[PDB]
Design a binder for this molecule. Structure first.
Ligand SMILES: Cc1cn([C@H]2C[C@H](O)[C@@H](COP(=O)(O)OP(=O)(O)O[C@H]3O[C@H](C)[C@H](O)[C@H](N)[C@H]3O)O2)c(=O)[nH]c1=O
Ligand SMILES: Cc1cn([C@H]2C[C@H](O)[C@@H](COP(=O)(O)OP(=O)(O)O[C@H]3O[C@H](C)[C@H](O)[C@H](N)[C@H]3O)O2)c(=O)[nH]c1=O
Ligand SMILES: Cc1cn([C@H]2C[C@H](O)[C@@H](COP(=O)(O)OP(=O)(O)O[C@H]3O[C@H](C)[C@H](O)[C@H](N)[C@H]3O)O2)c(=O)[nH]c1=O
Ligand SMILES: Cc1cn([C@H]2C[C@H](O)[C@@H](COP(=O)(O)OP(=O)(O)O[C@H]3O[C@H](C)[C@H](O)[C@H](N)[C@H]3O)O2)c(=O)[nH]c1=O
Ligand SMILES: Nc1nc(=O)c2c([nH]1)NC[C@@H](CNc1ccc(C(=O)N[C@@H](CCC(=O)O)C(=O)O)cc1)N2C=O
Ligand SMILES: Nc1nc(=O)c2c([nH]1)NC[C@@H](CNc1ccc(C(=O)N[C@@H](CCC(=O)O)C(=O)O)cc1)N2C=O
Ligand code: NA
Ligand code: NA
Ligand code: NA
Lengths: 398, 398
């Protein structure tokens, strides 16, 4: 007979809540949404939409203060919570850093900017201050030297979810231990510290710092870094050192811009993502591999959620998908409605007549049991459509 | 052999002294910095040293035309162009552990960033800023309480020994170069801190604020100010005010308590002038009440008078025992190299009270030390004709 208030947004609020509904069947859940939650799924799920679709009441923070015998759990929530205004003190938060480092804002960029190898997530209490409350549990996170602010954000979402999950019984049962945050090594960045409205690359810096500025600001659904009009998608460092003033453009071609820094010259790769996506329809390994500078651009997505594997799978392109997957791409990658590669390869199989591919993708680890966000498998869509031919063929693989 | 020393302060002077002693036959040419006044201050004037010792002072343009010489820059202020020499025996001491902290304000930035360590590096002068290949380096530990001035002093001392330990290899071409790493390379230009408009930022953690204080505590240039009131360090409390960061919570004659992003901070108002005045005659009990930050006891006025020196000159033995216990140097010098023993002897001379000498001798007072004129205390006594004092001091000398 418990109550929990979940205040926040995105896949973390969604996936924690999914877990609570399945695992704590009889808990009453109340939700608070963030101001900019459009109730529509984008590269993150809408928490508002999830709650509507799954009969979770949506309340105000004002209304939530007046609840008794409820845990409060903030998951990338956007409004200051004032502990005094509840009748208890069971107020909790996931913050996307290894506290007490990187309190405050832009924790997907700042660590990268500062040349960190690691970050973390932290479960702690909400007290009056900004990420000041006592720590309950933490998990260290490795940042690979190629990963972007988006890859890091995605690790935070994943690990933050898991961490809430490994501790939520102890929050609900008051069975948890806390410890006050240390003084030493504490750091905080306000909203002022980056003006995302007015981004500017600083070339009076080292190659390392410049590469890290690129990584820090590479989060496509918001922005890419820009050099004199042109969008950039990562870069590299050369062994040469230009005598030219830092910022000086040494070379330009259609794929890359080379620039002088405080030490080593840096190559900045022009963003060719749309172009790589058009090509993924029918071109082959050779041609695509010739288009690619930063390997990770194969895992990027447009506003619909379409990655290269997805567009390829939708157009038949079997030899590409094999190579994409050898490059580390996900054979069961999904768009922003939960739609899987398998489901894309369906529309082709249907429109072509050629089912000789399907076993190829199965060897590669394709999974037919997967459902989208309306709980529908590929088998459900085929049944619905009347394509018992295609249906029965596919059922053979089970 | 021949050598060109280009730079300023005790590092230039003391490297040069070592060469005059231990490499008699090398010819030495000197380049001075543009703000070397010729008058010794908290750092010696290299200019003065050179004029006093008949070392010729030349320009960088003249330096380029000297073959048969290696070039060694020591906190030098002018851009060196390697293509204008007819050789490549060009070396620098930079005050950081490269490839980190290239560029400016190296006694400030590492402290600002919460570093536990820094270093000094010996490397080649290349076309860029602090970019040339490394020859040798040494780690420096930054103690938690040390200020920017303390770290500068460590840089000067350690930079000096790094040169001394390597200079034969430089002169003999037995040294080994290795190009700087890309990874972890950092750089701070002159625009990163504006010493004309220093403001403390209280939208930061208590750690970050104490480190702001440390970083800006370099008395010869400035102290940090809160409301035009000079501050000499501070401490963190265990309370955390709800008030907005920067809200002053408590004032008194001695300190100012402020809200930060996490824990409250005490800023100590600077009272060094008052402390130095009181050391003439007051006892340890009175000075103890006056002290907040213990390191204020090692500070100096424009003459180079520290507490221990003022106490010596007034025969304040009881206070000297305490200061030493506190960490003060028993052989502390003013900016003319005049030692505590030289000041004590003036007190013994005027007063006729000699009893205190043994105590100071037992605390490690060193009577062999020379000032920047190569005079010992005994040379002063022989010149004044004071034999009885000479003999007495000599009798207690260990
Ligand atoms: C606003 C913005 C964000 N980003 C990136 C960097 C951020 O780490 C990431 C997420 O942005 P965000 O607006 O969610 O804000 P963050 O600063 O990441 O998180 C703060 O704001 C949240 C609502 C939470 O209260 C969180 N506890 C706060 O630390 O998106 C951009 O690349 N461009 C942008 O223009
Ligand atoms: C990948 C891809 C998709 N499309 C199409 C297919 C869709 O009708 C439309 C929007 O795609 P979407 O990712 O929003 O797909 P969804 O609406 O998520 O999934 C539907 O379309 C799939 C192909 C299956 O039919 C599935 N069972 C449907 O529920 O654009 C292209 O035109 N070019 C493409 O390269
Ligand atoms: C100028 C200035 C310096 N300082 C401190 C911080 C500095 O690290 C330290 C020394 O000052 P400085 O003018 O020598 O400048 P730094 O920036 O330390 O050294 C640079 O300039 C030198 C001439 C050398 O070329 C060196 N390689 C450079 O990095 O004193 C202040 O506290 N207030 C000040 O206004
Ligand atoms: C320390 C101190 C000094 N004075 C006076 C005495 C000094 O001669 C004068 C200048 O101080 P200073 O540190 O510039 O002295 P210096 O010129 O460095 O040294 C001279 O005076 C000393 C007392 C020694 O006898 C030494 N042998 C002399 O060379 O100020 C007063 N009150 C004081 O507290
Ligand atoms: N007490 C409290 N502290 C926090 O750090 C925190 C919460 N509540 N709730 C959600 C989110 C809110 N963060 C902020 C930070 C600054 C402003 C502001 O300057 N106006 C607003 C909201 N947050 C933690 O993420
Ligand atoms: N080539 C070279 N690089 C250096 O880093 C260097 C020297 N020379 N000589 C002395 C000092 C000078 N540093 C600087 C750095 C930047 C500006 C500027 O562009 N403004 C001027 C002087 N210095 C190294 O200490
Ligand atoms: Na360059
Ligand atoms: Na400046
Ligand atoms: Na506060």
């Amino acid at each position: 007979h418990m109550k929990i208030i979940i205040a926040g947004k995105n896949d973390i609020a969604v996936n924690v809540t999914r877990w609570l509904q399945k695992k704590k069947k009889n808990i009453e859940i109340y939700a608070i949404c963030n101001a900019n939650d459009t109730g529509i799924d984008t590269f993150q799920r809408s928490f508002k939409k999830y709650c509507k679709d799954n009969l979770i009441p949506i309340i105000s923070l004002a209304e939530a203060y007046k609840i008794d015998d409820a845990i409060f759990l903030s998951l990338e929530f956007d409004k200051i919570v004032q502990p005094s205004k509840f009748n208890h003190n069971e107020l909790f938060n996931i913050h996307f850093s290894y506290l007490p480092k990187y309190k405050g804002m832009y924790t997907s960029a700042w660590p990268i900017l500062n040349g960190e190898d690691t970050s973390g997530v932290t479960l702690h209490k909400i007290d009056h201050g900004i990420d000041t409350g006592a720590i309950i549990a933490q998990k260290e996170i490795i940042i690979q030297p190629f990963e972007t602010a988006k890859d890091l954000y995605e690790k935070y979402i994943s690990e933050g979810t898991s961490l809430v999950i490994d501790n939520i019984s102890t929050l609900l049962n008051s069975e948890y231990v806390e410890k006050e945050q240390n003084i030493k090594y504490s750091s905080y960045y306000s909203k002022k510290t980056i003006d995302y409205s007015n981004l500017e690359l600083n070339f009076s810096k080292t190659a390392f710092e410049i590469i890290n500025q690129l990584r820090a600001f590479t989060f496509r659904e918001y922005q890419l870094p820009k050099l004199d009009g042109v969008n950039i998608f990562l870069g590299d460092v050369l062994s040469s050192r230009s005598i030219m003033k830092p910022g000086s453009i040494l070379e330009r071609n259609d794929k890359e811009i080379i620039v002088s820094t405080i030490d080593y010259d840096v190559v900045l790769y022009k963003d060719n993502f749309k172009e790589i996506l058009e090509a993924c329809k029918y071109s082959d390994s050779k041609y695509i591999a010739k288009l690619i500078r930063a390997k990770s651009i194969l895992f990027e997505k447009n506003i619909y959620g379409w990655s290269p594997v997805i567009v390829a799978a939708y157009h038949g392109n079997i030899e590409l998908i094999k190579w994409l997957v050898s490059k580390g791409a996900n054979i069961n990658d999904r768009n922003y409605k939960g739609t899987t590669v398998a489901m894309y390869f369906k529309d082709y199989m249907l429109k072509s007549g050629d089912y000789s591919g399907l076993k190829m993708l199965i060897d590669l680890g394709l999974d037919l049991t997967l459902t989208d966000y309306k709980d529908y498998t590929v088998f459900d869509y085929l049944e619905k459509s009347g394509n018992k031919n295609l249906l029965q063929y596919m059922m053979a693989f089970m």
